Amino acid sequence: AIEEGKLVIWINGDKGYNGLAEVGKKFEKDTGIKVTVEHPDKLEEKFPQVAATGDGPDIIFWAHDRFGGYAQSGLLAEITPDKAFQDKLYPFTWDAVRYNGKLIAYPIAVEALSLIYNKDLLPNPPKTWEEIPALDKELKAKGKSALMFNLQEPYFTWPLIAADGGYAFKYENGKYDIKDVGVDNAGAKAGLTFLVDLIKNKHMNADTDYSIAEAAFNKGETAMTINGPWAWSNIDTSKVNYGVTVLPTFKGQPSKPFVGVLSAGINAASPNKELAKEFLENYLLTDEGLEAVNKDKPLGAVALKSYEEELAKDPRIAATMENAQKGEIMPNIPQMSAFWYAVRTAVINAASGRQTVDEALKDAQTRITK
Ligand SMILES: OC[C@@H](O)[C@@H](O[C@H]1O[C@H](CO)[C@@H](O[C@H]2O[C@H](CO)[C@@H](O)[C@H](O)[C@H]2O)[C@H](O)[C@H]1O)[C@H](O)[C@@H](O)CO
Secondary structure (H helix, E strand, O other): OOOOOOEEEEOOOOOOHHHHHHHHHHHHHHHOOOEEEEOOOOHHHHHHHHHOOOOOOOEEEEEOOHHHHHHHOOOEOOOOOOHHHHOOEOHHHHHOOEEOOEEOOEEOEEEOOEEEEEOOOOOOOOOEHHHHHHHHHHHHOOOOEEEOOOOOOHHHHHHHHHHOOOEOOEEOOOOEEOOOOEOOOHHHHHHHHHHHHHHHOOOOOOOOOHHHHHHHHHOOOEEEEEEOHHHOHHHHOOOOOEEEEOOOEEOOEOOOOEEEOEEEEEEOOOOOHHHHHHHHHHHHOOHHHHHHHHHHOOOOEEOEHHHHHHHOOOHHHHHHHHHHHHOEEOOOOOHHHHHHHHHHHHHHHHHHOOOOHHHHHHHHHHHHOO
């Protein structure tokens, strides 16, 4: 039934747990309360299991969308940050941790796709998607392509599809309307058609995936790619001179990438909810706290305004946030899963010629609203 008087924190092995332990150290140094950081295997699957029996960690870190299912089972305590603290974070990040009208976690980091370009091949990247075909023609004359990115996952193609109007679920007043889905509308239609046209016109290949695109950019064969902060470390080793900027606009409208927010939830069965609040609010979500973690392993962009403004000195992080604010938080409802699978199938089929754009989207829409 969770031990009282200390804090047990669970965070994934690919995050800065060592850096976080540094924050726990200061917490114990000031309060005399011990903080233990653990990163068990398959922790996202373990948490709902142990938390269901009134056990598990006091605090759990994970992408915000997975917290919707946890909150649905009443695994997370409703947090109580005052207005002063709420003003400390970007407002859109608070939307990522709200379930059934209640705040159930503290936003920590922000991640979204950005346009990654090769400064030596394209020092002045295109501001619009419409400009890409002509650029590809010019680059192809050199044996290079203009753009290569993962076309197998809807997460990567959606930014373009949503640009002129596509959307997963209408987020009206604090909640998502599962009856209002925007996959089979005019905007999504135009976006997908543009994508399909790039393929038909030989500017992109329907088979291009993550690994294919990554190697191409890393070897200087393509001038641009679309990826997240998680991929930077795999480019840095490549030595290629790259930059990260805002995604291209389509029909004059900004691309709208989905946003993932690393969040920290408090176990509903924790008898240390107040200690958790103190740690998260006044130790972790401060410039000194986030610096400790970030310095260990990059968080990318962060939810805390003050520190983000400091990190933004890195154009890659600034671009990450610019795209995120123009994007949409990933919905934390069960239906979002149906959205991913249906749209994944629609884009694949439309790109291969298996389905026309109209039928692909209509079919996706019809299944998502079921
Ligand atoms: O290939 C590396 C990625 O898995 C990367 O995660 C990022 O990209 C995926 C998309 O492939 C994002 O997943 C989201 O979107 C897909 C639909 O395309 C859904 O099936 C997922 O449920 C949804 O989360 C992911 O959010 C994004 O971080 C790496 O894992 C990276 O996170 C860590 O190296």
